[model samples]
Target: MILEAHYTNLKCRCSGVISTVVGLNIIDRIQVTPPGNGCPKTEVVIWTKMKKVICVNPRAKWLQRLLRHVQSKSLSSTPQAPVSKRRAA
Candidate 1:
């Protein structure tokens, strides 16, 4: 019930992936969604200049680098650490 409540209004746009966008001007912002909204693959959305909303392939190296950068920054700020670091379980 709680999970349903959490995702009741959530919608996935997997069918509408544009796959590519031309390198134009500055990137306004980025939006990425993991495989949770009934979509198997990760979704990457970016907003460029001129109010262009584009769907980019998440497998790109640039995307990976961005993800890594964000992850590192997040870890440095306030990490998602558990009570104890575990060994190979």
Candidate 2:
């Protein structure tokens, strides 16, 4: 199944790098925009690994929830360091 979601005003370290987590993987393709006019129109473009460019709409509540879920799930997963191996004498 193909799932596409958009998010705006999302504050995270990855925001600077213009990337977000989706489906247990990092999506490096993104575009962030600042607010404008009386209302804020922060645009966050997410290019999925499946080769789908999703332009998220901030007004969508379900999308927001999806982003939150993905973000939380990603944060819960921590990378494990590799073990060191010694050479035989």
- By lDDT, the best candidate is 1
Superposition-based RMSD of candidate 2 using all C-alpha atoms, in angstroms: 11.4
Lowest-lDDT window of 10 residues in candidate 2? 12-21
Q: lDDT of model 2 at residue 58?
A: 48
lDDT at position 13, candidate 2: 26
| TM-scores of all predicted structures | 0.47, 0.35
Candidate 1: stretches off by over 4 Å: 1-9, 14-25, 38-40, 69-89
CA lDDT of 8 in candidate 2? 37
What's the C-alpha lDDT at position 22 in model 1? 46
Q: Please report the candidate that would top TM-score against the real structure.
A: 1
Residues 10-54 of candidate 1: C-alpha lDDT, one tens digit per residue: 455634566454453466666666667565566666767767667
